[PDB]
Write an enzyme that holds these catalytic residues in place. Structure first.
Site, PDB file in Angstrom:
ATOM      1  N   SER A 103       0.785  -1.221   0.000  1.00  0.00           N
ATOM      2  CA  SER A 103       0.000   0.000   0.000  1.00  0.00           C
ATOM      3  C   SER A 103       0.825   1.284   0.000  1.00  0.00           C
ATOM      4  CB  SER A 103      -0.993   0.010   1.142  1.00  0.00           C
ATOM      5  OG  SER A 103      -2.127   0.770   0.751  1.00  0.00           O
ATOM      6  N   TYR A 107       7.268   0.371   8.492  1.00  0.00           N
ATOM      7  CA  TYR A 107       7.206  -0.925   9.180  1.00  0.00           C
ATOM      8  C   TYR A 107       5.743  -1.346   9.468  1.00  0.00           C
ATOM      9  CZ  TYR A 107      12.279  -0.352   9.650  1.00  0.00           C
ATOM     10  OH  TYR A 107      13.614  -0.129   9.413  1.00  0.00           O
ATOM     11  N   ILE A 164       2.202   8.577  -3.300  1.00  0.00           N
ATOM     12  CA  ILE A 164       1.715   8.802  -4.641  1.00  0.00           C
ATOM     13  C   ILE A 164       0.552   9.773  -4.602  1.00  0.00           C
ATOM     14  CG2 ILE A 164       1.082   7.743  -6.764  1.00  0.00           C
ATOM     15  CD1 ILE A 164       3.530   6.496  -5.792  1.00  0.00           C
TER      16      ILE A 164
END
Ligand SMILES: CCOC(=O)c1c(CN(C)C)n(-c2ccccc2)c2cc(Br)c(O)cc12
Lengths: 231, 218, 242, 213
Positions: free
Chosen positions: B129, B135, B168
């Site tokens: 994702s 982490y 993004i």
């Protein structure tokens, strides 16, 4: 034509990278240790230069020359294959310094030198060829391992510094690449893909990184070892 | 239909949409899946001649098997598979997260394994994702799982790789200060990575995480 | 007569090196520490009392390294715990990193490790006992700008340690790296505060470390309780890097 | 005495770990799958430990056990969780459930007591090497990091210990010998102590040089 400089281009991985970058539309300066080597490179394309990566003045000579003649270096591929394996007890100072100089220092000096062209140009690819032995302990490779690990770390730092200027700096780390049958099979058993690599495989990855398709990839190690080492 | 078939789960918008469009230029016939029938209808409209939209809820195993079988019959074997995307939370929320993000990948990978073994060619690519504004457990889980699959599928000449986006552009911005290249990515950047992995130029890359984050993380 | 095993700790004057040396003493090693000056060495003597000895050493010089190890064997015993520690930096953006900024940092960190490592092997291969602990850093893995030379040296130390661990295994010598993160040091004491906090935000434990934290790690690897751990990197960075 | 919970303490590594934590000075609750096994554990701990029966399959048992430990001995401040191809979904569900699902539940359960005391250790031991990128091992290691980041704020450390070959196999190992359970217990004792307060999210490899990372 943006110019690309590929050190160690005479054979194997280096030759494959220089050829592939031609196909990609780059004008490619390949280098070799001796003038015999540079002229062949001149022929294989239609520009080769002789360079000893150990010497600062030669490095300054070649890059200064290229910027005058062809254009600023915009893709730099630091490739070196020389090894001088020995157990530590049998590894000399000269054996240590030589490999550290040819692999790691050369990357520092050429990466330092090309930054100017890349910064003006708004565009830059520095692609450093490391190896899987940076991560896999193999005896008699203390010097080689350290040099390659150092290159990867260096690339990450340099990537942070120059990112603002749209310059990417990456490492590509080949695995067992072809170039004793039992030795071969023992290497193969370790690779998930169950075979050894070919220089074209590395050329393909370097080409990818060198392109506009990889404009958002920086500071990374791209592993090309068929599952020999995963991470 | 002649081309090799690539299956892209969650191909509706953003990264998923971009991946599927690229794989088409690359010359694959692409079957992009959405969760609902209305969603799948949209894909069919936009892929046109060189794709198809099928409805799939990656959570149900029978639905997974039904969809691949339908593709096997109508288009051809699935040679490329792209799986598109705080622990102090409820147990159910967690199980749902791992059904969708991990169990599904396991199911689809096992399901398509035979066809790839026969053709002695296969690509499995898992997209973790987008980073919220490292982490994370889902990402970590998915990347550890890709390595293990890769160890097993390797002998058959199948590569399994993950691709890790950073920031993004969804909509939206000084998150970009955290990015060395000093900007947010575009879906096409992830699409380009997937395409390289999906092609015949990446045949010796496996078990790897390809990071596409502009130096957000190194 | 001195009957303790001998540990050599390079760069023991302050910070991490100091803490390591004090702790190995408590563990019952006779500790020789080094400093960059004779006056620095004196202080170590005035601190190690009758349990340790200070010596001046410029780690960049080979002869000087041979002289010091020779002198240790001559006055105290073979070196069976070697801890390569160095804190010196020469930060600069590659634009302004000179040839000497590079060479000097690589010589102090990576080269010294090769030289001292090599010089103490046979003395370890003989007693069949051996601990080489190389202090690394998190910047070997955590991209940090202006530290290109220091990051390359440290990453190189880690790889060198793995390779040597393989060759020295048969002899029961372990070779490990310990990699500290953001450790509160004299050098970290000098920085701003919103920036020290900027460092701490990144740590999972949300605090900077202590030299004693690194000393605790090295003591563990140095001891008989880590005889089956070799060729690894022990990270002590509070979750900064996982 | 601070309380340490060690699951799977019946034999080998888990047994050595429980014994070392006792020597170190923790009061140790070891778990066994059945009640006689738990009684055995109790006999061997003297008066410095206790045994409880816990089949890690069932989440419901975890609530009763930790509650039992809280009410009788104290809050759990150290928690040691002790230990794969193309097989049926069920085999996968079972391995994951033991190796990962149980850990999550246990970790969640001891979280408030650790949180209140401002001290905590969760230590997950992966399985010995057989006879690397094994899924249970990779999964557990990945899971420990994720738990570390979330639990760091509370001054709780979460780490993993990864044994190699524990009592030719020896020829592959750099030190040229097999390890002993005591090798793992030593590593665990180090992490569980105040010596390892700044170590989190890591994997401590104890394989004699079998693998180097
Ligand atoms: C579908 C196989 O993966 C899992 O079921 C889970 C994984 C991925 N691991 C195995 C690489 N993970 C996982 C998820 C995040 C990080 C590491 C492992 C699981 C964790 C729990 Br708890 C669980 O019950 C199942 C899984």
């Amino acid at each position: 034509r943006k110019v690309a400089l590929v050190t160690g281009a005479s054979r194997g991985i280096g030759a494959a990278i220089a050829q592939q970058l031609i196909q990609d539309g780059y004008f490619v300066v390949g280098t070799a240790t001796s003038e015999s080597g540079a002229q062949k490179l001149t022929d294989s394309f239609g520009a080769g230069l002789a360079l000893d990566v150990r010497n600062l003045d030669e490095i300054e000579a070649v890059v200064s020359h290229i910027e005058q003649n062809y254009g600023p270096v915009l893709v730099l591929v630091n490739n070196a294959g020389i090894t001088k394996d020995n157990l530590l007890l049998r590894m000399s100072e000269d054996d240590w310094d030589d490999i550290l100089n040819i692999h790691l220092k050369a990357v520092y000096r050429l990466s330092k030198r090309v930054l100017k062209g890349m910064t003006k140009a708004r565009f830059g690819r520095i692609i450093n060829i490391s190896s899987v032995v940076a991560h896999f302990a193999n005896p008699g490779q203390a010097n080689y391992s350290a040099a390659k690990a150092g290159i990867e770390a260096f690339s990450r730092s340099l990537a942070k510094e120059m990112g603002s200027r749209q310059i990417t700096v990456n490492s590509v780390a080949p695995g067992f690449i072809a170039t004793s049958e039992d030795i071969r099979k023992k290497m193969s058993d370790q690779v998930a893909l169950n075979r050894l690599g070919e220089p074209q495989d590395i050329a393909n990855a370097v080409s990818f990184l060198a392109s506009d398709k990889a404009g958002y990839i920086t500071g990374t190690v791209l592993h090309v070892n068929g599952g020999l080492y995963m991470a």
